[PDB]
Ligand binder design. Structure first.
Ligand SMILES: C[S@@](=O)c1ccc(-c2nc(-c3ccc(F)cc3)c(-c3ccncc3)[nH]2)cc1
Ligand SMILES: CCCCCCCCO[C@@H]1O[C@H](CO)[C@@H](O)[C@H](O)[C@H]1O
Ligand SMILES: CCCCCCCCO[C@@H]1O[C@H](CO)[C@@H](O)[C@H](O)[C@H]1O
Length: 340
């Protein structure tokens, strides 16, 4: 109605003074790093357990300030059940002149896909549900012209109703990366993330990491052994002469028979894996196409797989001063409207 600034309180946490609205109670540290620090809390207003992140050094430099702005813009835009979103953002500052600290609030997440899966085979029905949610989230992320680029089990939050959210941080590190990402290709397709989904899905089905490379080259050797050496269609799109001549020099390997590799799996799962784990990124199934695949028939609802509002990322190409990034960040804090 009902206008005021909330009443704040102060408490010493993770070696600094935290100043938060009184709705957030029982702060308990959960982690600290270069980035800032996170406390778990109880939001008495919503009845939700939340995580409150206080950014470290948000405006220390142009690059810090642009990163802070980027993070707030992204979190503000992401409004989807299977993607991290923003419950609240606040500052104790009462003016731009006072503005120094940024706090971000989201649902408390205590378990990632590894924490829940624990290296065991999941049932096919359970794999359908988890992969469906990842693809549902990716459809939304991709529709905002965003590519995750490092999707992996540690970036997937899952609760005890195995409801899943895609994150861009963690609560082995390269095993799920697209081969073009490990070769610093640039010009990435959104299907870089589909490769990662194939890697994750394979592992949930078999209980084994698909490409557990020891290092960069080994990872690539494991990939080529499964999917085969590049065909002529792929080779004609490689602009680098050294890349082409190295690839041609490799002994021709056929794509393995996925039906035999994943013997025992639902043949629809095998079919989907064959469509995700394709070396040529142009020939990989998209998130929207994958959601329509027969494997997900029990979960697919074409009227409840939403896309994002257009996401203005023009700021990415701007070179601005610190105070400008800071003011733009301040604007976004003030304009925040919580979800219903
Ligand atoms: C860069 S790495 O050190 C790093 C690790 C974790 C985090 C990190 N950021 C958050 C986090 C918290 C609130 C937000 F609004 C947004 C992100 C969490 C979080 C969210 C929910 N439950 C538990 C923890 N973890 C950030 C950076
Ligand atoms: C969890 C929400 C999805 C994470 C998306 C990864 C971040 C992509 O957005 C980053 O913007 C630039 C793109 O031009 C890279 O710096
Ligand atoms: C020997 C290992 C070869 C790896 C080949 C990876 C091929 C990835 O696929 C390529 O991705 C590019 C986007 O990044 C596109 O521009 C290309 O058209 C596409 O073919």
């Amino acid at each position: 109605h009902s206008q005021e600034r909330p009443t704040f309180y102060r408490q010493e946490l993770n070696k600094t003074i935290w100043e938060v609205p009184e709705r957030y109670q029982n702060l308990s540290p959960v982690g600290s790093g270069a980035y800032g620090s996170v406390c778990a809390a109880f939001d008495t207003k919503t009845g939700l357990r939340v995580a409150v992140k206080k950014l470290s050094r948000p405006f220390q430099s142009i690059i810090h300030a642009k990163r802070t702005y980027r993070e707030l813009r992204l979190l503000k835009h992401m409004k989807h059940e299977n993607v991290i979103g923003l419950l609240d953002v606040f500052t104790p500052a009462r003016s731009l002149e006072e503005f120094n600290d940024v706090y971000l609030v989201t649902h408390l997440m205590g378990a990632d896909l590894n924490n829940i899966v624990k290296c065991q085979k999941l049932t096919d029905d359970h794999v359908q549900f988890l992969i469906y949610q990842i693809l549902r989230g990716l459809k939304y992320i991709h529709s905002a012209d965003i590519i995750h680029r490092d999707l992996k089990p540690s970036n997937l939050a899952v609760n005890e109703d195995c409801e899943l959210k895609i994150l861009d941080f963690g609560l082995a590190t390269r095993w799920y990366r697209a081969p073009e990402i490990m070769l610093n290709w640039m010009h990435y397709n959104q299907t870089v993330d589909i490769w990662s989904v194939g890697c994750i899905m394979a592992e949930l089905l078999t209980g084994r990491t698909l490409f557990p490379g020891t290092d960069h080259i080994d990872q690539l050797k494991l990939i080529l052994r499964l999917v085969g050496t590049p065909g002529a269609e792929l080779l004609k799109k490689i602009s680098s002469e050294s890349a082409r001549n190295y690839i041609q020099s490799l002994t021709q390997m056929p794509k393995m028979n996925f039906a035999n590799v994943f013997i025992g799996a639902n043949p629809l799962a095998v079919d989907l894996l064959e469509k995700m784990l394709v070396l040529d990124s142009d020939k990989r199934i998209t998130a929207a196409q994958a959601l329509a695949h027969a494997y997900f028939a029990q979960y697919h609802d074409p009227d409840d797989e939403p896309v994002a509002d257009p996401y203005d990322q023009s700021f990415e190409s701007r070179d601005l001063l610190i105070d400008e990034w800071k003011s733009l960040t301040y604007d976004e804090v003030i304009s925040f409207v919580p979800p219903p």
